Amino acid sequence: HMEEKRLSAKKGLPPGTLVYTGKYREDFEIEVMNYSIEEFREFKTTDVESVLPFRDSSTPTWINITGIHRTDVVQRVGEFFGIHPLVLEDILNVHQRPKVEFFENYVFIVLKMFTYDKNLHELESEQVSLILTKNCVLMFQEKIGDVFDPVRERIRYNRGIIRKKRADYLLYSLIDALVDDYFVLLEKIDDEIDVLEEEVLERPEKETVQRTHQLKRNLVELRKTIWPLREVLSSLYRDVPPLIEKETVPYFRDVYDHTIQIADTVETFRDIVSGLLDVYLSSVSNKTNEVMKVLTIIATIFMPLTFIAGIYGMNFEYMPELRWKWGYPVVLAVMGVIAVIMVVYFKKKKWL
Amino acid sequence: TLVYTGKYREDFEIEVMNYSIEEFREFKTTDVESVLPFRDSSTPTWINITGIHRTDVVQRVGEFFGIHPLVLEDILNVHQRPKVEFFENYVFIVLKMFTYDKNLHELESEQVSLILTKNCVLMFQEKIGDVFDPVRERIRYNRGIIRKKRADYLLYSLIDALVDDYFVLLEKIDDEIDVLEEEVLERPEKETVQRTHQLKRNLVELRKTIWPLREVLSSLYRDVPPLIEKETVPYFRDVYDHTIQIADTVETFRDIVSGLLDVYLSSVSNKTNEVMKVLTIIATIFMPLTFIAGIYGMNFEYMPELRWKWGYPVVLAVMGVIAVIMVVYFKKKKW
Amino acid sequence: LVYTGKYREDFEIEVMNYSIEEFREFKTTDVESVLPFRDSSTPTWINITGIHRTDVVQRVGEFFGIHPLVLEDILNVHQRPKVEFFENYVFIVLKMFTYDKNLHELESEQVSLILTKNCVLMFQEKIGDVFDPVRERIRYNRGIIRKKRADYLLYSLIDALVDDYFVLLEKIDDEIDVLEEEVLERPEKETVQRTHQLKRNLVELRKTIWPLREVLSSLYRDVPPLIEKETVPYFRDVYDHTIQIADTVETFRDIVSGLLDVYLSSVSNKTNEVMKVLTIIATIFMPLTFIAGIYGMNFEYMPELRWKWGYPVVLAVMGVIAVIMVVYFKKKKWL
Amino acid sequence: EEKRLSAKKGLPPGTLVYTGKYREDFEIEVMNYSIEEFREFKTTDVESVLPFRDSSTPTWINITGIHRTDVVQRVGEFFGIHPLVLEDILNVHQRPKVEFFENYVFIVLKMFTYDKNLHELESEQVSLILTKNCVLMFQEKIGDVFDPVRERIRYNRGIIRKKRADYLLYSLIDALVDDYFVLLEKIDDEIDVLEEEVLERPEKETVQRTHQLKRNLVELRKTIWPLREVLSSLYRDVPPLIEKETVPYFRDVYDHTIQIADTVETFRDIVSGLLDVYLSSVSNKTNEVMKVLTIIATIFMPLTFIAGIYGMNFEYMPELRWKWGYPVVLAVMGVIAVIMVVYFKKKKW
Amino acid sequence: LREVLSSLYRDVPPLIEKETVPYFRDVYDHTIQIADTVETFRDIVSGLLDVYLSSVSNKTNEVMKVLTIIATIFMPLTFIAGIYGMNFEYMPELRWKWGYPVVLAVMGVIAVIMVVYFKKKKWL
Amino acid sequence: EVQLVESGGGLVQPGGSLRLSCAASGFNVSYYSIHWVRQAPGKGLEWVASISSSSGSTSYADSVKGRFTISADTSKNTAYLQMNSLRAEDTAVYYCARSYWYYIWSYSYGNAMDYWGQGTLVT
Amino acid sequence: DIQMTQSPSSLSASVGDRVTITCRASQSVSSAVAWYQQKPGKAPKLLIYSASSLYSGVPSRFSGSRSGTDFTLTISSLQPEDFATYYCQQSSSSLITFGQGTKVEI
Ligand SMILES: [Mg+2]
Ligand SMILES: [Mg+2]
Ligand SMILES: [Mg+2]
């Protein structure tokens, strides 16, 4: 989409149609959080014409549209706010990686929220998109549930310096909350790794290898998501677009460092999971080896004796051997000494 | 010296269509001489050549049109990936058709070439039957705006039809993947393993064919070739976007099948325990009794068992006692 | 409001007002006694242990003019280290790590540090902290700590925390030495679990170092108005100490990775050795018993019974077979 | 950067040592091009190349073969290049880096070639210096990736001929990144072949090739990350030498490097999966062999025991001359074989 | 040690004096050399260990293969010989054809059949 | 293209002194190291001295240390070897060699002589 | 001082057969070992440097190896023109020391 930024053409659709790509079509809600140095207001509506006038509002405002299966609402907001149709296509496109695009009038960012589920070893991501235009921040969500409650609490209770600063500080705060929830997700993954380690080291069950493999796949997907997030934060900190005001630019360095930490932790977790797999395979091999001990000792103490018995159990003639006197006790003592020697050799081998 | 590659050489047929904004005519013939005057006409035409094994025909058309030999070996070389060639007098594009069979899962690919020359488009097929029938139907029945345009729109129509056949192939593979995943999850069998392996190989072949084709379409539209009119740039752009769709679906499908393979191959554990316990207990039971039975094979004049009464019951009882002791000691070690 | 601390049994309140002209310490849990100390010109260090009773912390925060959200953060337990700057106070949260002998468990202990003007307030989840040397030095009137302000007290507490980290690292070093001796001496499942516990605890230490680095970096780079100089070189020294801690942890991680590789290699070697001995004896003696069984026939007419004294010939053949089987092992580098 | 050259041990002070392994060939190509003309010049004489320093029109100097430390020293002395920059030029065991000076910018890059039928990944360090109107470039050996830029200058194709030397630096870096993409395609084809081979037939050659591929991918990662860093540094500020018109191009190359890094990480994950697949397949094959061996052992050791019975030279045989004794023991034979075969079929062995 | 030498040539307290600074710089460069060599050696040695795992783990398969084939060939033949030879020796007295060569031919046929059945799927 | 030519020997009394000049053509003496290698009549090669003219570093074998002094002139592109208190054992075919340093590890370097002179006789 | 022990002092072999010349060092020289060929009445020619790297312009039959402190020179397919004396030269120290020599004869 980089080349000239045109609207792509699909095959099963009419040329100009915007199609929601995700799976969530349950809930729709628009929530506004308009605030100033002293006064703030907020309301929840299902009418978009009640949030359209806020485009020209001087005070910082936070329009939050939850549920993008309503392509009509997204298209209306884009038409009123002057958003490029390709940006709307990216907003409605869920199978995507985090990205940032700077336009002459607004900044478009794509981010992801994961929710690891216990007892169902899989993590599901939800795409959230942000548009920082003039003095308003547009937020788009797929379903009910987000990680931005601390920002709402800060606005409501006048904590920090959020009220004094402009919309770019609101964007900073939102990205900060999202990366903090990434830290929380990593903590949950660490707890799952703890449980998996206990299972591996205690009882080598059949499903433990499946759990290791699905955890490894989860870490792979997490890496694939987090690396573009680091790209986004580095671009925001270093390319300094005009909408950021150069006064909030140092506030993005903390978030960039946080993404670096998250990537390093994901790498270490992957290494730990691989080591757990190695330990599990070693334990299985050790069990088979403990079976080898008995099988090998039985074979190595029994085969030569039966070989001697077979050699002596033969019928020739014309030789002063075989039929003898007191030779049977001699052979008895022979394999008794052989067995004693083999036991002594086992004592050197340190097993049995 | 041109060498053919196609395994089969059964059939060979030549046809050509001359369409104009006013009138229309189509011609079918076997001799190669009949197609010579068709290029001289200003109206765009479309020569369909089935079977490249007839090397004299391709040599004649190459020398008459003014085509470099390397293009001739490339047309003769079936085993090659799709690519585009930009030359000062013509553009040379090779593509790959595909046929998928149900109830017997194989993926067969047939190379197709396309040469765009001024006001004529040359294509060299490999066998009878193709995916360009809708283009001929639109030519015959005055459907669309193809007649109102020049040969570039004809090349666009050919490529678009081929991409449409790719979409149909993707539908068939979608059905295959669905039934395969359902069967593997419901019951893992060796036939399902073979089907998964074949499907993964087919998807690999599809990727190797489709990813260069996207670059080919990008070259056709973005590079602004001198022969391709500026009016046909958006159409090549649309075909490029369709190829984007095909590539995305192919990658998703390979991810699904690779996940299926990993899930199937995860579990191998139980054998090393069960069969090895069975072997160890069987060997440890039956070797000592065999040794006790074989120690009496010693040949001597005198041996105590000869004088002892009921020696056979005694040795059988001793062997049974040893077996009982061993089996009881086995419960101490479990398994 | 909501408190989710792990420990609720202990509860004690400490106030320790120090100055060059006189020294004072306060005990017991009188909630109203701690309020007037905020008006003292001399620096004071209020130490609070036990947050399960939210009434005392609520009262002290309300009297000290602290935001309720900061108090809720104090009540939290699984909070990453952070520094928040406000016009009247700064909120510092850190981790205290304790390591017990005979158990390879790494334990966390959150501690909060807030200083306003001259008064410094602690927040302890459980009784016991590594600030005992600091308060002992305060009692003994040693160093320049008593002639400085509360910022130097915060620096001293952070330095004590870093020294506790150092002590933990040498304790883990001794732990690593013991487990290295064990793994090179005797491998067992317990050694595996203990070494892997070391690996996970080292990963945890690496994780926890980075937020400490971030909070220290912000502390000595933002030059807050509340912290008025006489702190930059000391915080930089603490930063260098953190760098050295990180380097030591990385070295320990390399050591434990080597240990785990050693254990895996030992298991593989033992399996190879047992398979080797079984296979060698099988291939040297089973064929000989097969030949003996062949020659164990009881036929009345055995043409091979008499072959120019074939008995020594047969045993010579058996010896040659054994020698060549052993040599074939030596030829392909078995033993 | 520092005035004092590093002091190695065992070497006389002030010495410069070529570090690599290639000493076969040496050649200097000069491609001086302007708005209206170009010139090509291939010699081994450094003196005929030195006067091109002060030419107003852009100059491209390509000195192949840096084992001749004398040529590097002469070029550095004439162009005013610091001795430490020359030491970095001659040092090969060095990850990509970019250094900014007052009169020039020094860039360390790395090429790569993959060999078919003998899977080995080789590296070659190339250094570029953009001084005034000239772009010095040092190479280890004949064979590079900048042939397309050569042909573009020859045929006056694109906007390269009408621009300054910084656009030439761009052209060279972009060509290098393009052949990085080509290398990635070759490696992906090899990974597909290895995947099929390991999934179809586990051998020692399979693990040898897979482990060599893993080492090569780690090397590629270690090379590709600093290259992304240096391209970032080239398009972020680059105050003195690079014009503000050329920065979007460097941004494009930075995006390309991001894509390359993503691809190599994907390849690493795929190769780890391949190693796990090989281990599982080998375990399965050993399990099948154990199944077979246990089947024959369990169906023949009891048979040998019953053969040992009626094989002892005792006085009292109960069935000493009982009729059909051999048929009845063979019936017991058949019954035991059938019942064990059936029982083993219950467990689906 | 590198950090120590860095301190000596960088902080340069008046006790060390200015004239000896370049010598400390030379020693610092020597320490740089040493550290680079140690890191390269560490990488080489870490690479060596994985080669050992690549080597020994590719031996158990062959050892197991040869043990399996020898056992599965020589146990049934041992049983056949044990049946045909016993101290009971209650067998058809009359030789009929060449009994021992016929038994040996059966032994060879069984061995060849077992060998042919093996390595069909290349498990060996 | 590269030649090394020696001169200045052939006959001297025991305890005498003379100078051997090595002439460099095709390369600069200050960008390389120049070595003197002697071969006694019916014997093997023996290393004598080596000078790196860029820094004037001189290294002498223990056999001829103090007796022989090596030097190099950058403008003249020539390296000398002035022997003193020359004995009877010193007679040999004194060669002049050019060497380049190569790389083994970060701590170890080696040098090898690639171009040799024709050598001169001293008695 | 570092001494190189080049054994054997003299060897004889036919044409077309592999010939190995070994050399040993008194102490630890890392890899700075070079091989030279001196035909009678001529200046030496460098063949191998770094104990394993074949000098440019030298035929590929020549090869070298290092086994700890042991160094060997091999000629895979001997040629009639490969008859001269060969020396092993350590260069780890600044006091270069040569080997005794090994003349190859018919
Ligand atoms: Mg086994
Ligand atoms: Mg028997
Ligand atoms: Mg018998």
Side-chain angles (χ1 to χ4, degrees), chain A residues 13-174:
Chain A
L13 312 168
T17 59
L18 301 183
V19 165
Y20 173 54
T21 305
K23 318 266 185 298
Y24 307 105
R25 330 190 86 106
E26 291 289 325
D27 318 299
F28 161 81
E29 168 206 37
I30 298 170
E31 181 176 7
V32 185
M33 281 215 68
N34 187 358
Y35 62 99
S36 160
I37 298 98
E38 318 95 355
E39 62 169 355
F40 73 96
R41 59 178 272 132
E42 59 183 76
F43 55 101
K44 279 154 175 184
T45 52
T46 68
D47 164 39
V48 64
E49 275 70 29
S50 173
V51 311
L52 291 203
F54 278 104
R55 169 193 49 152
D56 303 278
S57 296
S58 66
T59 56
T61 178
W62 176 14
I63 315 184
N64 177 23
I65 299 98
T66 295
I68 62 170
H69 66 267
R70 302 272 310 258
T71 59
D72 63 88
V73 183
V74 178
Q75 272 164 280
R76 187 76 191 83
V77 176
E79 278 175 11
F80 204 60
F81 280 82
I83 313 300
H84 188 245
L86 182 46
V87 179
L88 308 174
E89 152 167 28
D90 291 283
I91 280 152
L92 296 159
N93 183 13
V94 167
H95 306 91
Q96 214 180 0
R97 304 281 171 211
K99 86 211 275 184
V100 62
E101 295 193 283
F102 311 104
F103 295 84
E104 47 169 300
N105 267 291
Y106 55 102
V107 160
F108 176 47
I109 316 174
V110 173
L111 309 167
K112 302 279 179 170
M113 309 178 243
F114 291 86
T115 46
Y116 196 61
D117 189 358
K118 204 186 293 184
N119 310 94
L120 277 296
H121 308 309
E122 65 183 1
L123 82 172
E124 302 136 11
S125 61
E126 158 201 359
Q127 189 192 91
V128 59
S129 285
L130 298 93
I131 287 170
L132 166 70
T133 195
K134 44 202 91 173
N135 44 8
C136 178
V137 172
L138 276 299
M139 166 160 287
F140 299 93
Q141 282 192 50
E142 293 193 28
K143 56 187 183 74
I144 291 294
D146 66 322
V147 310
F148 313 122
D149 272 26
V151 192
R152 302 189 226 260
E153 293 275 90
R154 286 198 278 262
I155 291 153
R156 282 172 194 142
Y157 300 132
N158 208 318
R159 188 206 172 171
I161 67 155
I162 183 166
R163 320 283 316 261
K164 268 70 68 175
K165 321 273 290 189
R166 284 170 281 306
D168 49 0
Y169 199 64
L170 184 57
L171 184 83
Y172 151 69
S173 298
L174 290 167

Side-chain angles (χ1 to χ4, degrees), chain A residues 157 159 197 254 258 261 264-265 282 289 292 296 300 304 307 311 314-318 321 349, chain C residues 67 80 196 200 206-207 210 214 270-271 273-274 278 281 288-289 295 298 304-306 311 318:
Chain A
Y157 300 132
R159 188 206 172 171
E197 182 178 1
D254 270 319
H258 289 184
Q261 305 191 37
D264 186 74
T265 315
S282 66
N289 191 358
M292 293 298 291
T296 298
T300 198
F307 153 75
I311 298 300
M314 183 278 288
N315 297 334
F316 280 169
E317 297 159 357
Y318 276 4
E321 74 154 7
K349 289 311 277 150
Chain C
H67 206 280
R80 270 179 78 262
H196 196 274
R200 283 258 321 278
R206 165 155 171 171
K207 274 203 311 283
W210 290 48
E214 178 190 6
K270 186 59 67 66
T271 300
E273 191 171 8
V274 66
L278 174 55
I281 190 166
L288 271 59
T289 315
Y295 282 163
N298 285 96
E304 286 82 4
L305 190 145
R306 187 82 273 151
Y311 165 44
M318 301 215 168

Side-chain angles (χ1 to χ4, degrees), chain C residues 25 27 34-36 58-59 69 83 109 124 132 160 168 211 246 254 263 279 282 284 314 318 321:
Chain C
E25 186 262 8
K27 202 88 195 188
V34 303
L35 320 169
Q58 164 54 290
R59 168 81 167 179
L69 294 174
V83 176
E109 161 74 344
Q124 305 264 351
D132 197 72
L168 187 153
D254 310 301
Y263 162 74
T279 296
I284 172 169
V314 170
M318 301 215 168
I321 285 158

Side-chain angles (χ1 to χ4, degrees), chain B residues 208 265 268 272 296 305-306, chain D residues 192 280 287 313-316:
Chain B
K208 294 252 181 303
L265 262 175
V268 294
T272 72
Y296 288 127
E305 60 90 19
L306 279 189
Chain D
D192 290 330
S280 171
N287 293 10
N313 47 14
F314 275 69
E315 292 292 328
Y316 289 164

